[PDB]
Amino acid sequence: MADKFAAKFVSHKISRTRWRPVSASSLQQPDVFATGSWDNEENKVCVWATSDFGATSLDEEYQGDPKQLCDIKHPGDVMDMQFLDKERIVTGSSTGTVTIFRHHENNQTLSVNQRWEQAHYHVGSNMRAPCTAIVCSSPEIVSVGEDGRINCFRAESRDVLRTIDDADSSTMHGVTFLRTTEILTVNSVGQLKLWDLRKQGNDPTQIFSVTGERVPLHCVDRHPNQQHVVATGGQDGMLCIWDVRHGKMPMSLLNAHEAEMWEVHFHPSNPDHLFTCSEDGSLWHWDASADSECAWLSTDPTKGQLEITNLLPSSTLSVNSLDVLGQNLVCGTDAEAIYVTRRLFS
Amino acid sequence: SVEESEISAMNQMSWLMKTATIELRITSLNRQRSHTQRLLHLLLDDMPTRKVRRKILRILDSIQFSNEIPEPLQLDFFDRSQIEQVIANCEHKNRRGQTVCNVKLLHRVLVAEVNALQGMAAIGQRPLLMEEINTILQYVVERNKLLQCLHAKRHA
Amino acid sequence: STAAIAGSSAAEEMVALLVQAGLFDTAISLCQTFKLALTSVFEGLACKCIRLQQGGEAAQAEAWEWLAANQLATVITTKESSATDEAWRLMISYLDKYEAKNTLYHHCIINKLLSHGVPL
Amino acid sequence: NKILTLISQIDVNNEFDKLKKERGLGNKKHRKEVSDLIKECQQSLAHSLYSWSCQTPLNREDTLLLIGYLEKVTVEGDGSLDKVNLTLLMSLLYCLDVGFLEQGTDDREELMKQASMFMDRQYIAAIHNRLQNTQPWKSPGMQATVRLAWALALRGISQFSEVLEFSEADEPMAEIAIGGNVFLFLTEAVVGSESFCTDEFFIRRIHKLVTDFPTLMPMKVKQLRNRAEEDARLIQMSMQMGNEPPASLRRDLEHLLLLIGELYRKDPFHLELALEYWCPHQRPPQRQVLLSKFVRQMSDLLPATLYLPYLKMLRGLASGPQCAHYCFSLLKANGGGSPVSWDHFFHSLMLYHEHLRRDLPNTDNIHQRHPPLRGITQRELDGLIACLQLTCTIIDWSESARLALCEHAQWMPVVVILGLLQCSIPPLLKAELLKTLAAFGKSPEIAASLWQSLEYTQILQTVRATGLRQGVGIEVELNEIESRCEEYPLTRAFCQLISTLVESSFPTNLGAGLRAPGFEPYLQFLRDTVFLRYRTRAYRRAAEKWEVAEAVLDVFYKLLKDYEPQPEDFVDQYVELQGEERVAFKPPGFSLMHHLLNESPMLELCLSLMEEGVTQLDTYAPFPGKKHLEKAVAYCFMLLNLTLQKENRFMDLLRESHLSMIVTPLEQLLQGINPRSKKADNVVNIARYLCHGNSNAELAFESAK
């Protein structure tokens, strides 16, 4: 399976990787992705292509190394990155700044479209304290940080629409939309928190936690079709599955990794697949479809054999980010490397 | 005796012909006498055994080489000579080389003729025109049926 | 059938079913008695004119039945025109004649028109 | 003796213990064939007895044997006499059937001499003694029902000659029958069978049994009606002071009203039998007058507890167009205050609309609390639903009623209903509202006005307003509410509406000024959402999964079939919206078809659905949704078929129009190996549908084609 990916060597640490969203009406496979770098005083955002703009042969083995289209130098260390749409990229910075970049495809350039230089900061001292995660639902943007704040922005508004000050006395690490006006946050004390933006009170609507476990939460993802099914990963390498309507405890606890689980992602268009990466250097593909030929909520160990495959060679370097679109997967590493496959299921 | 489609009966007979023909040819080219014997014996001995016309002649008797002809079209509001010309024209050549409007020209051609005949004021005369077009249709249909029956007989 | 349903009818169910099947005279009469100001007749006739102008053959064959159920006060004066022109002439007539102090008029017509496509 | 014994015992025993054990029956095919042959044999034997009973009446010994068999019967615990048992039952019904005594034919004496259940005092005594036994059958209901029929017979026999000793035994027997709630067993166990749907003579016999009860013993009937109404009222009111209703209550009238509603709800014969409920040939037969009086008498001072059963009864009685019209008018006029009037229905909807809007919170106001949303009580909800269902049934069968109801100046039903749809209620009510709209839409012009109204009301959010983005409409309800409930009534109803509207026109310019023409948005929505789902989204009911797929594919199919293209289609224009040029909206089907000539998931999904269909059909197991699947796959194949023709056509045109669009031939797509399969099984599967040629011929034809 190692022969499916071309690996490109670049002198830049890889933290985040994301596919450019394709229109649901397009028969075109995803071909472009972005990367963020870290571990430096100054880092960059890069845009990459997987195909040569011009190969019309349906029959050539993809040995194509991903090609850098363009880059931009970002002040501070890049933390998180998402596409807002086809032309706009949002970043969270180690400086606590949230920035919207505009990509000008005709000229192959990036430009600063908008910034919030005081999105994340410690109340009182006023010292910089990192924007750790962002989530987009156009035109709305939510950010979280080490200052325990939840900020709500609108892309066209210069002012912050809402701040929830002192939302967490601990660092928040992740945020997702539950519903249009409700978010979930996770923090360094092993809590999953639910919250409504509309509600005036800064208090969370609900708090979930493992009983007797202090372990911090590093990642969270929502099942695309089932808004109540959530996956999380921890410092112990455990995969937790939650039904946010049923109790305050996970429905399933699965031994996934030997070390810290950095990211978890459902496949955006085929959510019977899930992907996870770890400090142990591994990148796992989880397949819940194997009995058909929500599977993730099966409590019957006799129904739904999960097939599990390690995608990288043994003793692989830290895999900080992955993204999956159709038959294509990209991931970024601390080995100054981008791995790309265009034939995930072949 | 597929009177139904004398056409069908005829086609049946035709194919059967070609077939048994090449059959006997090759069987004899080989030397199989008994086979050939029984075959032709039967086929030709109209002589009564255990005036019984020979089968080959009976087959020829079943083919009528004379066929009936359609009542002349009569038009109260309309020229006949013109309708016969129109019938001659829109009768396009089918794959067998027969001039037939077929459903095509028929339907669309009839609609076009009705559109051309404008009868504004005298709405009152409408049922008549309706019945009249019906007969024209029946006639062209009969004519086409007949042409088809004919090419069939030719090939047979 | 509606013969039976006329056995328990009403002052406007009638108006509607009848404005339904052509009969654009019988109903202007039922209305002017029970005084109930009629813009449903003009909108429905405008709809039939539009459907005819974009109508198929079958629609032209059915149209002679409702056209004959009216005169067309007086018919004609030259080149013929496949209905089309037929209902637009019943227009000029059922308009200029049966016309009102306020607006059962230009407005209701221009509207159903821009409403379904039409260089006026 | 021999006959019955044989059939039954053989069949059941053998199969169950030798063939269901050893499975000599082998192939998913052989097993089925053997199973079908065995079931056919059982059915042919049962029919033989039935066909006989329909002709020959039964002798004393043979009748006792039949009764002896029926004493042991299990209606399957599933609650439906299987095609065989239902037939045995109707056969017995005809054996007993004495309806031929009511038909004034000059042959009455000859027919009386031929009916074995006519000249033997011992016949009546033996049956009566068996049915009086509180040895009920394996199925107390069996003892209760036959008893009642024998009793109606006894009731008439007084008139014929002078046989009126057993008239007395009819009231207690009828009481026992009613106490066995026969009305419930006939409703759940008999008509429960979908095979009941088949035999015209089943419906006629039961129709005679139901019509003979009010005709031959209405005195008792009325006694009982009044009794019930009164007791109900009393205890209910007593409790209303502060107590709870006595656990000893028994609403046989409601069960009676439901029975009437269910009995005529759907007739396979479609002989407009419901005509018996209507009195305008005949100078009104006395029977028709009495029944009509029954329907009217039940509407006079209707207790709140009987309100629902009565509506359900009316709903059942308005089948068969003539009947439609008649009951329609009847009730309309009866309301000319009785809790069942057009004034009560539309005033109630208006009150709910006014009450639910006031509970709305002003944007300027911060933190708004309702004087506690009077979430329409569950009973009120059930009542509204029943009313809408009745309305839908009446307007579906009666065009006069449909037009009369829509044009009424005070009720303005279309406005009210559309207004209520903009309010918030649990999905079931929304579904019923959509169904009611669908019933109104079977009439062409209303449809044109309805498209304009739908575009203005932005039920489906066409153009985003004030950064509405996601949700703010049926899309949010689908993703947040239906997906959580794992039930999809709203989505289905919406698809039904669209489907009906597309039939009356792919309409035209649906809104200038707002968007920029096109039926484009609806399409996107439909497609994306529902197909994605169709694949992955929980479904409490496993059958619902396929229902959603069917509803969406139905729309896709109609859009592609309805589309015809003539050179202007491949010419495309860019409309300026909010300062950005956007390619406008080609027809429904230009788009539909571009997406098929390439491997967009649609195809895949279509091909996957076909594969799934054949796999499920190869199991020959009776899963729920098998039919639906059939329909859907049929839709699929038909889609495919039209596709090739129009394909040649478009490809051609496409080559002429110099559009940079790359399309692939349908045959080439069929050749291509499935990615999941990683082999050319595309064709293989299609084929396999030929194996089901006996089972599903339609599919077979399409496949071969």
mmCIF file of N, CA and C in Angstrom, chain A residues 24 26-27 137-139 179-180 225-227 271 294 345-346, chain D residues 467 469-470 479-480 483 528 536-538 598-600 675-676:
data_model
loop_
_atom_site.group_PDB
_atom_site.id
_atom_site.type_symbol
_atom_site.label_atom_id
_atom_site.label_comp_id
_atom_site.label_asym_id
_atom_site.label_seq_id
_atom_site.Cartn_x
_atom_site.Cartn_y
_atom_site.Cartn_z
ATOM 1 N N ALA A 24 -20.845 20.458 -5.489
ATOM 2 C CA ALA A 24 -21.589 19.193 -5.529
ATOM 3 C C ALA A 24 -22.069 18.805 -6.945
ATOM 4 N N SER A 26 -20.154 19.278 -9.654
ATOM 5 C CA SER A 26 -18.962 19.003 -10.448
ATOM 6 C C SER A 26 -18.674 17.508 -10.456
ATOM 7 N N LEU A 27 -18.479 16.954 -11.650
ATOM 8 C CA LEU A 27 -17.935 15.605 -11.828
ATOM 9 C C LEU A 27 -16.412 15.561 -11.629
ATOM 10 N N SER A 137 -19.013 28.587 8.947
ATOM 11 C CA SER A 137 -20.305 28.315 8.320
ATOM 12 C C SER A 137 -20.761 29.608 7.651
ATOM 13 N N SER A 138 -20.322 29.822 6.405
ATOM 14 C CA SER A 138 -20.448 31.107 5.703
ATOM 15 C C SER A 138 -21.831 31.758 5.869
ATOM 16 N N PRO A 139 -21.906 33.035 6.301
ATOM 17 C CA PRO A 139 -20.802 33.987 6.508
ATOM 18 C C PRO A 139 -20.230 34.011 7.942
ATOM 19 N N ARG A 179 -25.534 22.903 15.683
ATOM 20 C CA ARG A 179 -26.629 23.487 14.902
ATOM 21 C C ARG A 179 -26.244 24.925 14.550
ATOM 22 N N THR A 180 -27.033 25.609 13.724
ATOM 23 C CA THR A 180 -26.743 26.988 13.271
ATOM 24 C C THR A 180 -26.417 27.978 14.400
ATOM 25 N N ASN A 225 -23.864 13.135 8.245
ATOM 26 C CA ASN A 225 -25.314 12.922 8.110
ATOM 27 C C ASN A 225 -26.084 12.803 9.440
ATOM 28 N N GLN A 226 -25.420 12.429 10.535
ATOM 29 C CA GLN A 226 -26.053 12.185 11.828
ATOM 30 C C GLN A 226 -25.551 13.204 12.844
ATOM 31 N N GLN A 227 -26.246 14.335 12.947
ATOM 32 C CA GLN A 227 -25.846 15.477 13.782
ATOM 33 C C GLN A 227 -25.687 15.182 15.278
ATOM 34 N N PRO A 271 -18.955 8.569 4.562
ATOM 35 C CA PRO A 271 -18.682 8.616 5.994
ATOM 36 C C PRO A 271 -18.667 7.252 6.691
ATOM 37 N N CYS A 294 -26.364 3.992 12.057
ATOM 38 C CA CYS A 294 -24.994 4.408 11.823
ATOM 39 C C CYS A 294 -24.073 3.265 12.251
ATOM 40 N N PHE A 345 -9.078 3.829 -2.537
ATOM 41 C CA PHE A 345 -9.826 2.569 -2.518
ATOM 42 C C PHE A 345 -9.451 1.584 -3.647
ATOM 43 N N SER A 346 -8.389 1.848 -4.427
ATOM 44 C CA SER A 346 -7.962 0.961 -5.531
ATOM 45 C C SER A 346 -7.031 -0.162 -5.106
ATOM 46 N N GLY D 467 -28.045 36.834 4.883
ATOM 47 C CA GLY D 467 -27.097 35.757 5.232
ATOM 48 C C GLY D 467 -27.789 34.584 5.907
ATOM 49 N N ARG D 469 -28.126 31.561 4.765
ATOM 50 C CA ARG D 469 -27.201 30.409 4.571
ATOM 51 C C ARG D 469 -27.944 29.081 4.764
ATOM 52 N N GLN D 470 -27.404 28.214 5.627
ATOM 53 C CA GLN D 470 -27.964 26.862 5.904
ATOM 54 C C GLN D 470 -29.278 26.955 6.694
ATOM 55 N N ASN D 479 -32.319 18.357 8.240
ATOM 56 C CA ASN D 479 -31.021 18.040 8.824
ATOM 57 C C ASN D 479 -31.083 18.013 10.348
ATOM 58 N N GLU D 480 -31.873 18.813 11.032
ATOM 59 C CA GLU D 480 -31.855 18.982 12.481
ATOM 60 C C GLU D 480 -32.984 18.196 13.141
ATOM 61 N N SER D 483 -33.701 14.220 10.789
ATOM 62 C CA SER D 483 -32.536 13.352 10.932
ATOM 63 C C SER D 483 -32.389 12.856 12.368
ATOM 64 N N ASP D 528 -29.198 16.641 -4.391
ATOM 65 C CA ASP D 528 -28.174 16.467 -3.405
ATOM 66 C C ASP D 528 -28.681 15.824 -2.182
ATOM 67 N N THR D 536 -26.606 7.275 3.457
ATOM 68 C CA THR D 536 -26.371 7.264 4.928
ATOM 69 C C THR D 536 -27.083 8.260 5.850
ATOM 70 N N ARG D 537 -28.053 7.793 6.630
ATOM 71 C CA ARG D 537 -28.790 8.637 7.560
ATOM 72 C C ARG D 537 -29.694 7.671 8.233
ATOM 73 N N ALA D 538 -29.655 7.612 9.543
ATOM 74 C CA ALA D 538 -30.415 6.595 10.253
ATOM 75 C C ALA D 538 -31.880 6.575 9.996
ATOM 76 N N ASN D 598 -21.362 11.139 -17.599
ATOM 77 C CA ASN D 598 -20.060 11.115 -17.015
ATOM 78 C C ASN D 598 -20.313 10.251 -15.801
ATOM 79 N N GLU D 599 -19.310 10.026 -14.975
ATOM 80 C CA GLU D 599 -19.515 9.102 -13.861
ATOM 81 C C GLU D 599 -19.830 9.788 -12.554
ATOM 82 N N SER D 600 -20.478 10.940 -12.596
ATOM 83 C CA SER D 600 -20.886 11.563 -11.357
ATOM 84 C C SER D 600 -21.603 10.523 -10.558
ATOM 85 N N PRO D 675 -15.805 0.928 -9.302
ATOM 86 C CA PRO D 675 -14.625 1.131 -8.455
ATOM 87 C C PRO D 675 -14.598 0.241 -7.203
ATOM 88 N N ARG D 676 -15.729 0.129 -6.497
ATOM 89 C CA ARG D 676 -15.786 -0.714 -5.271
ATOM 90 C C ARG D 676 -15.571 -2.183 -5.651
#
